């Protein structure tokens with residue numbers, strides 16, 4: 001009955017985002033609709049600022065802070081998209097931001113975050129080293145940590161996508177969503193379920209690593225990870241506390257897609273729809289082509305989220321070659 | 322403005338309405354989202370019409386389909402013919418498959434294999450012949466006189482123009498308060514169709530054309546008052562590599578098109594880089610033309626604090642070429 005985020009938080013976020021972050025395209029897809037024997041629409045969060053949706057939740061958090069909180073500075077850790085989302089937000093709001101990264105994060109991602117204003121700190125040869133440094137920085141400098149998903153405002157920001165979907169297409173039947181730590185689907189599901197709960201919200205993760213999926217099937221929080229994935233944005237072994245709480249209550253299903261199916265989805269998106277997607281941005285479309293949603297999607301209206309496009313063209317060519 | 326176009330120009334709002342009906346449930350409305358990068362850069366609201374995501378990878382399906390569909394069954398049973406190195410070939414070829422029509426497409430012996438493959442995959446017979454358009458166009462008329470196939474012009478035809486104009490109707494539906502529409506010009510079919518649709522509905526909307534500095538037949542004609550050839554050399558916007566505009570298109574353009582601006586190869590390249598890197602959409606050179614004009618500063622007096630639609634006309638370019646043109 002009681003959840004840690006409500007429609008009001010997403011309506012508050014809408015208002016903080018009003019005139020700053022903007023609605024992305026959601027066109028009917030020719031290729032996917034023919035393939036899937038139903039109407040497939042593609043939500044372009046890859047074309048949101050910074051190249052992923054992460055700006056939304058990050059902008060809501062950072063601007064819902066008090067001046068007393070903004071003076072404290074802020075801090076995060078990421079090798080890609082979250083780093084970029086907080087940085088643009090830190091420039092936009094003029095908040096002093098620092099961002100920790102491992103000592104081998106893509107050079108394209110390492111400059112993109114500096115250009116966006118925030119100070120990059122390269123440190124350690126793994127992800128847990130990054131978190132070790134953040135804890136030290138918060139401890140010593142007194143900066144506000146910006147969670148990539150497990151935060152009510154972050155989730156609220158993300159939810160603004162759900163409003164956009166129903167605003168553009170409110171005879172939508174299905175919404176298909178990628179999951180890492182769980183903020184995108186959490187936000188989206190609250191927005192959708194609060195306004196039209198008969199719209200089915202379906203999650204997607206890689207077979208290689210799916211903490212949230214494992215938690216969703218288990219009934220409590222648990223880890224799952226064997227190896228990495230092409231959907232690197234969703235390489236998250238253990239799902240968030242707030243996010244799992246919401247997903248278990250509101251998400252109608254979570255499906256798993258293989259690496260080959262992620263690749264096939266990337267190929268179709270760039271080749272047959274002309275949109276640049278990274279692996280995590282192709283997860284939802286992977287699930288459509290897999291055949292695992294056919295009974296949900298056939299002769300119905302289905303929205304597939306393109307969560308990000310931060311991938312080097314050479315890597316696209318490698319995968320879609 | 323509706324009645325003046327009807328009475329005085331060779332294509333009218335009625336033709337566009339006929340086309341919308343023929344395309345109904347076969348060709349669908351492409352997206353038209355606001356662009357973050359271009360709005361920031363232009364200090365105004367920029368919307369991107371994604372004909373690169375239309376069937377075949379460009380808008381040319383609209384005109385080809387409207388034309389082929391408009392034929393009597395007697396005409397359809399004669400079969401059709403066309404020549405193209407890419408986008409028109411694909412449009413004619415798919416339209417032939419959708420309508421059950423017997424098509425024959427002549428392509429130069431040296432077109433990008435991907436385009437040749439795509440035209441084949443559909444339905445039409447691909448006749449590879451000659452190293453240029455003059456060679457391929459020469460082979461077409463032989464086919465016309467020998468086999469009696471109906472020729473499908475790429476732009477200078479009232480059904481083809483009407484077909485393209487359905488784009489104008491979709492812009493009005495999605496964005497009734499649009500101020501500007503920026504449109505690439507090869508032969509002028511796309512902009513002719515859009516100009517008729519837009520101006521017949523709300524004539525206070527500006528329709529502005531774009532061509533490469535390297536080849537701009539329509540621009541030269543426009544500014545000369547006479548059909549005129551222009552070509553210095555080839556362009557990245559190869560889809561608009563047309564040295565002499567159509568007769569019907571020039572007539573329509575010189576009445577309804579507010580201006581035509583020219584953009585350099587650097588500007589075209591910059592626009593492609595922006596569309597792919599900053600907006601995550603694949604565009605071929607011609608599909609980048611309108612966006613090139615916006616970023617060049619050459620439309621600064623029209624777009625600040627306004628609503629402006631940029632036509633992304635096509636996305637038919639090999640990912641390998643996108644890589645070497647871009648970063």
Ligand code: NA
Nearest residue numbers: 578579580581
């Ligand atoms: Na003029």
